[PDB]
Amino acid sequence: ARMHARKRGKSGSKRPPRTAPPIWVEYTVEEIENLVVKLRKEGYSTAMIGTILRDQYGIPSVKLFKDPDNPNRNLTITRILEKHGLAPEIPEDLMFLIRRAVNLRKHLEQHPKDLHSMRGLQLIESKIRRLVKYYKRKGKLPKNWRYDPETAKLL
Amino acid sequence: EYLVPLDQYLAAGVHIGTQQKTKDMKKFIYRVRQDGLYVLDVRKTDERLKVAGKFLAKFEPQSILAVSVRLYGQKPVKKFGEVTGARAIPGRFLPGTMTNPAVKNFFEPDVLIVTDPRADHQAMREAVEIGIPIVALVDTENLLSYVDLAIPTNNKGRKALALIYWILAREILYNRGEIQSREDFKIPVEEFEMKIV
Amino acid sequence: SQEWKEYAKRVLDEWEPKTKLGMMVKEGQITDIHEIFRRGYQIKEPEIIDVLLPEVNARENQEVLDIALTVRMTDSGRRVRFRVLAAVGNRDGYVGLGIGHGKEVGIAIRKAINYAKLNIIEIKRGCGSWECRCRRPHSVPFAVEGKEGSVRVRLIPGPRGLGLVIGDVGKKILRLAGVQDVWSQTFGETRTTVNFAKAVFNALYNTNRVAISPEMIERYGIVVGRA
Amino acid sequence: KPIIPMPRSRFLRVKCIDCGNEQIVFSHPATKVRCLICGATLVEPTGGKGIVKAKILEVLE
Amino acid sequence: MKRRPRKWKKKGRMRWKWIKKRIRRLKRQRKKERG
Amino acid sequence: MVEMKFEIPVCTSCGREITPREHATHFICPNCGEAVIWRCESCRVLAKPYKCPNCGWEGP
Amino acid sequence: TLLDPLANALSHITNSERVGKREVYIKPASKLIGEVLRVMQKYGYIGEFEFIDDGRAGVYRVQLLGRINKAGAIKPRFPVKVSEFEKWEKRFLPAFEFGILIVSTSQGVMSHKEAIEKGIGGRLIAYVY
RNA sequence: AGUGGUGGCCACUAUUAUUGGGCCUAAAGCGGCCGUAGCCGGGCCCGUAAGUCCCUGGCGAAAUCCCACGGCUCAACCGUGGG
RNA sequence: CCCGGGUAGUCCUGGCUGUAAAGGAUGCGGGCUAGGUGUCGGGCGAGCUUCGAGCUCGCCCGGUGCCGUAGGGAAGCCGUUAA
After folding, report:
1. Cα–Cα distance between F43 and F49 in angstroms, integer?
2. G96 CB-side CA count, 13 A
């Protein structure tokens, strides 16, 4: 994470170059479909869904399995949650950032003098706005959609 | 096959290295001990020193210099030079020895023998400035820059010094043909070792 | 020519060889100049080289580049000292440069000449201009650089008859290196003649540092040293 | 530095203690690992290798 | 008012702080009498 | 004029020729003892290994 | 942030050479990079090379033969017609044909001498000698 | 049969720097951070041909410029022919 | 300059003023590049254990030095934390 903290720390994580999924996965594409719809039915976003699936269920990655409905695409959790109407409208990361934004703005309301968190607010707001600008360049949001603290409160 | 018994080697401190390593001698290093001292490879040491014996015979006896500024090696080198007719210089190597013709003891070898690479820096610089091949008695702390024939072992202990110098005399006089068998040396280890006064 | 062999004989039966290299030149095992350089030997007795290249002794083949009067400040006066820099070479790809300290003109001159003899070097030569390409050793075979201090000098092949397009110090060095047409450019100040000379030396040495195919040898006619 | 990055995390075919349940689990879990039937925890996430408590049967790569 | 570091070396010079302050006092009086 | 093409010595552990005043070395091949292994500074200071052309013996 | 594979590749090659190692592993491997690696190998400046599917971007493994004085990437992709190569050649080479230039042309990226023989200009990408 | 003095312009000058300059100690990195336009941007497949490149018609008039030849005694100049 | 006092100041509240040798006198991001060694912090593996990651050793990653090969630079010096 260098883009603001400017520290080149490497806590990233690695995936081996496997092209076909391994054999020891005793579940099939429909079974992982059943489990992922169960999981998101239980109220989890993609990151925690995939973590627990690779953790307790053991399947290393759903990206190693090819979507039946398209030969060129490798199956992903987001696509599956899009299949059944369980993907979210506002992309998950940005919803999280809005939630943290309203959180910090409240704490800041009851605490004006901590300019350190003023700067933090400035940071997280540039973050959300960059993500939103990008997604506008892609068009997965309504074009009139634009940040407001108050609707974030409604969020 | 070993020139000397392995247990003799282990008793001689040949395989005992320091608490340090280097990228250069990762190959020669065998393993580490839980305390910290490093262990060299015995078999590689034996192979390299028999190779060195195969080498040194190709030169003249007198032409080869052997120098040890480390205290523990001075009698091993004098004894080896006596045995093999090589020239030997213990103590403080006079700077400008082979580089300065006006000196009294001017002599230019065709190969060098080095006891401790760290201590014998001056010898290497002189010999290089003459431009000759270099042989070294290295440790897991010595450095492999500017050595044509490095041999790994413990280059501090007196027992190791005498043992390896003895084996070197054995192999050089083997390959020189003056003495064919190993058993013709009636000069045991204690003749090369240091005497504690 | 015959006079050079006479000089070689005079020194041969006068000089007593001390170094390890003195034998193979006095005993005749070595007779090629490039014999010394190839193997990676050393040189310390200047008397060696005139045996194989007595032509260095020619009065014209020795060049005095510059004479500096560097002072030393003492508690009890100003003690001058002559630092003289001079070059000596043959016109077939061997040259050398020397710096000699002294109390008079002569002593510094002699010591500098001896040192320069000791720093003899081999010179590749060719023709790699974009126009001439005549395969002869009438120029540096290809572009090179030489760095010393502030000064960095780049030498570029040129067509024949162009002459030495370079400052006077480089002119003398290249006249005594056996080269006669080259473009030259300099970065850094060239008023300190000593560094200019040393930089040209570095460049000439760097010529041999360039990787080459035999194809290139036959294309520019790369004469390694003596033509 | 290894040219191709090889993961330092393996997978583990393990047997739970209570209900005799086989499972595939991960060496460096980011969260808790629990059994399907009895529900008890299996491996605890920490700064490094997860804290196994059941019996490891086989090591998968 | 972007002070040159070169001027801070006291060789053949007065301490820069005080020259700056002198210029400021002169500025004060000049702007004053102007208006 | 009979052309005087010498064989300029080539270092063994890098393939780069030996510049004239390089203080390089030449010594007999180690394990068999017929090949003249050269060694240049660029291979000496870092002391990268050399492999004999004949016996495949590798060493510094 | 990595932005240009080729320049990092050729710089990595030269920085290996001046040390003079044997094996190099260009992490940013691309099809164009492989074509380039073919180019000078057809003048043997390198030994063999191989592609390795790393699962992310490929990695090219290359042996050196110790024959690269300097290998730089002309970054601003100067387009050049046939008739003026001598100016740009003189811009990046020490002597007459002393090495090569790699040009991307309508037919496929490869060296410059043939491109003169085939008489097709293009866009300079790299130089090496 | 010109030379000298002065003035102004290019080289000298990599002291204007794309080719091709520096910014720790010589003058030169702002106290720090955010980010708009601009500029520079990972790889693979399909298409396009805007750029990029090759060929081809019209056109960029003459005089000046490069080259061979002819006239002026030679030259400069002029003409014819090619760029 | 030393000593005896002494106002504004130095403290809290609200606002302004936008400055310093704010100096590593070193603008930031990526790729490459011999090494030696410590501490800091995270992880892993051995050894110790009065069983507290509580104590010694090896490795990997990030920050922080010191020494240092090649290499740079007028030199001071720098040198994988680059100049």
Report:
1. 8
2. 20
